[PDB]
Design a protein around this nucleic acid. Sequence first.
DNA 1: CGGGATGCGTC
DNA 2: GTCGGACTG
DNA 3: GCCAGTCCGACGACGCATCCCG
Length: 535
Amino acid sequence: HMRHKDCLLREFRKLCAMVADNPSYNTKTQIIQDFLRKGGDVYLTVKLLLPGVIKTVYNLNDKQIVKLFSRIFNCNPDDMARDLEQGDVSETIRVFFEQSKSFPPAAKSLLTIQEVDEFLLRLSKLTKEDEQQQALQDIASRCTANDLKCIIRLIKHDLKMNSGAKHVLDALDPNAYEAFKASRNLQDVVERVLHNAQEVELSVQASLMTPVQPMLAEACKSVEYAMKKCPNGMFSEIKYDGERVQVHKNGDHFSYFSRSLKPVLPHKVAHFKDYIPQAFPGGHSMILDSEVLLIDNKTGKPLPFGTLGVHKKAAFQDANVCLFVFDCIYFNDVSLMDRPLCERRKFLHDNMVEIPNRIMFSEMKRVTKALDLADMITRVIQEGLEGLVLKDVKGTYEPGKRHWLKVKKDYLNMADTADLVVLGAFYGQGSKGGMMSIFLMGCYDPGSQKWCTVTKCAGGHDDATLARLQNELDMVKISKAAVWEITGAEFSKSEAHTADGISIRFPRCTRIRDDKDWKSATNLPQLKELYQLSK
DNA sequence: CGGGATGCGTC
DNA sequence: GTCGGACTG
DNA sequence: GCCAGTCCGACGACGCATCCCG
């Protein structure tokens, strides 16, 4: 009983093709809705509808996919590579799927979406090239091409239809989206909607041990701005340059979710099962929202961002990892997402005991009047602490919603900055495609008197300006001057960009400087200096 | 057996 | 993390 | 016309894991 029409790739594709060819979200979700109501497996169509939200790792991508299919097709992998420049592997494959006077497409579309899901599962367990090519072949040899194309889009986590979770889930129930954010497990949502739809003839609760879409922070560009959105005053916390960790604990089972709700790599969380119970006497269950950091144990100071790597962790003889708890969503079987922050933070202090260098309250001063805030921004840029995170006081806990504020030096107006020389180019993928979307930014060096690399750059430019840029730029084609102001959070060091080892955290481009055609742009020792002033 | 590619996941 | 560009009410 | 609240895609540096293939 998986053999009805609604379970066919052909129909699934129909669905995908329709939604993409229809630019209003209102109608996109309507489309899905009609389909789920009129005309088949519910869980799977919604799941397959969200390859980028319900992610399975295949260890494949443009490069490898092309390698492996040139093998099954018996054709030249150079030609496919040129075709990768239009920026869509799915299309690139389908085209090279009739060319094969050796591996021809199937006669008719006969795949049931269960088989595609069962396939993807088993694909995801593969890791050696041999095994993958096989699997891929097993499936590919049952595909209308139309089929195959779709199925590599699934592999690629992107159905190119402009409908993400919100819009797909809205077809499922007035509250599916909201409910999903509070307990982020699709199968459970559907099970719940089908138990509801059952009894005729959907409540948004958080569930202990299953992830909650963490609450988010909006970029806030001025004090004026922050003041407006916190009409009740705010709590100002220091912005930990760490990794967000949501802790769930149930009796003595502990689980640790990351920002993306993936489990946290155990080497940065394995030791907390030991402290938390001491941090929280008589808290059998709870869900905490925190940041994890590697702390310098001999000085109290936290260590910079990269430092959370296993081998980096390992270099320091001073530190183990530490947790800064800045929120509490749930505790002893009761959700607190609805309570206002001011009440939640109160509960924290009222129930947690700080344990030295492991489990730590995040420091949050009340701020209430503009001047007092603007001082704090200055006070904190001073010793290069990343920024601030400001939260309204009466605010409740709203999963997934960007309602907190984050402030950092590069936002107001004060930003780390380099007027860099553009050298090279790369093709963009998709919407941007067959174009020079990305750019290679570097500096001249009077040392070896050769040119030098600092960071790539894509952001900054609007669509209208990008297409004009297609012309004004010289033609470095070999894959085997002009000058831009680029702008980032900081300046980083590592053994990868030729320039001594320096680079830009979140490189963006701001000004297009029509003045300083080389020579006046930055050179190695100049930048070498720039970096060091931030220390 | 060890460099090179490719991919993943954290900001 | 960044950014530019959309659809909604 | 305009908003603001939110999505959606198309992207960066770093640190790391695993497989390849000579």
